[PDB]
Amino acid sequence: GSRARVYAEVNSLRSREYWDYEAHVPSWGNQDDYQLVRKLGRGKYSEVFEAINITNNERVVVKILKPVKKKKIKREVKILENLRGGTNIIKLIDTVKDPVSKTPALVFEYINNTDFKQLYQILTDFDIRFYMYELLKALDYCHSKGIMHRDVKPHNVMIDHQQKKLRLIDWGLAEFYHPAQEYNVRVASRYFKGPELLVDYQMYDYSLDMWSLGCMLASMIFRREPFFHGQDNYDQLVRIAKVLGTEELYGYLKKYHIDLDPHFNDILGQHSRKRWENFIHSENRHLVSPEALDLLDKLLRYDHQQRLTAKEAMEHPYFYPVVKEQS
Numbered sequence: 010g011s012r013a014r015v016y017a018e019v020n021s022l023r024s025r026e027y028w029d030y031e032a033h034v035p036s037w038g039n040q041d042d043y044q045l046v047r048k049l050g051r052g053k054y055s056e057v058f059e060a061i062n063i064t065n066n067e068r069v070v071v072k073i074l075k076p077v078k079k080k081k082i083k084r085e086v087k088i089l090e091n092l093r094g095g096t097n098i099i100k101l102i103d104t105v106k107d108p109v110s111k112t113p114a115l116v117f118e119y120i121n122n123t124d125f126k127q128l129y130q131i132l133t134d135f136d137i138r139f140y141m142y143e144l145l146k147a148l149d150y151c152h153s154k155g156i157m158h159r160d161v162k163p164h165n166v167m168i169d170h171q172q173k174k175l176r177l178i179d180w181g182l183a184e185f186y187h188p189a190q191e192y193n194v195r196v197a198s199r200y201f202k203g204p205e206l207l208v209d210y211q212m213y214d215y216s217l218d219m220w221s222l223g224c225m226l227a228s229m230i231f232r233r234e235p236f237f238h239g240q241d242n243y244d245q246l247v248r249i250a251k252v253l254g255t256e257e258l259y260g261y262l263k264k265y266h267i268d269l270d271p272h273f274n275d276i277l278g279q280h281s282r283k284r285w286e287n288f289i290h291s292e293n294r295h296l297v298s299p300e301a302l303d304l305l306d307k308l309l310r311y312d313h314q315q316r317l318t319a320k321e322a323m324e325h326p327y328f329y330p331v332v333k334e335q336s
């Protein structure tokens with residue numbers, strides 16, 4: 010058994026219509042109002058374009074949803090409607106369909122993002138604190154709304170470094186949290202998967218997103234991106250254990266009665282827990298402080314119940330300079 014430490018019952022306490030996305034009936038506008046300009050990328054079930062709304066000249070991002078269970082489309086639309094106005098959550102502007110083919114598309118606000126591979130190289134200590142604080146506001150918001158993002162990674166955090174705007178994007182893997190529900194562990198990018206996913210523990214919660222955020226924090230302050238760079242899902246756990254330690258892993262497995270896939274016997278080895286200070290060197294020293302290491306140590310923990318919540322993390326002394334600056 011496992012339950013979220015916060016927000017556990019928040020969907021139960023709301024109208025069923027709030028979380029019963031299969032019953033949701035979107036209002037589908039007309040895609041002919043949008044002119045595609047440039048392809049920006051694609052997902053497994055999506056293609057993404059920069060576009061212009063020709064009725065008002067607004068620049069937008071259009072996500073055209075290829076074949077996919079209409080249930081997954083309803084889920085993403087309902088989650089985005091529930092998160093409307095949330096702090097640092099990408100704004101859904103419109104839901105539209107090709108009026109002939111009825112192919113659906115989602116229209117989002119445009120963010121002039123700096124590619125994270127270039128950005129992370131130039132961030133100052135204060136920059137990291139600021140952006141992580143802003144990202145935490147997005148996670149606290151969605152968690153308070155009963156939603157797990159489940160795909161937190163640099164590619165899904167758009168940062169306009171000139172205007173200092175941050176948005177958490179791509180809610181296509183997000184899901185409603187319900188206590189005791191068993192969820193599919195095939196979520197998140199390999200490098201950002203929490204240990205619970207890697208050991209096939211299905212009773213996870215919002216704290217999965219906090220592992221992913223911790224991975225991002227580590228990559229920023231230490232300038233090793235991704236921080237845990239597995240070659241596959243098995244090696245991903247080995248990379249984690251070489252830092253957190255194997256004895257600590259086994260304690261986690263025992264607490265939650267977790268059966269470890271026996272292919273791990275050949276590859277985990279034995280590893281002491283490493284001090285976070287071992288990652289400091291001349292290239293990253295200016296980004297690391299006792300406060301950063303204390304926060305990171307409280308995010309990158311095997312035991313999902315022991316990780317800080319997004320609110321607890323925001324309240325950590327590491328962010329005091331950000332809070333002070335904003336007043």
Ligand SMILES: CCC(=O)Nc1cc(Nc2cc(NC3CC3)n3ncc(C#N)c3n2)ccc1C
Binds near residue numbers: 120178
């Ligand atoms: C709707 C986009 C999504 O859910 N995923 C996604 C985004 C993307 N690239 C993007 C890229 C940008 N701006 C970059 C070009 C300057 N922006 N700005 C806002 C949004 C949004 N939303 C955005 N998505 C590339 C591939 C995929 C799969």
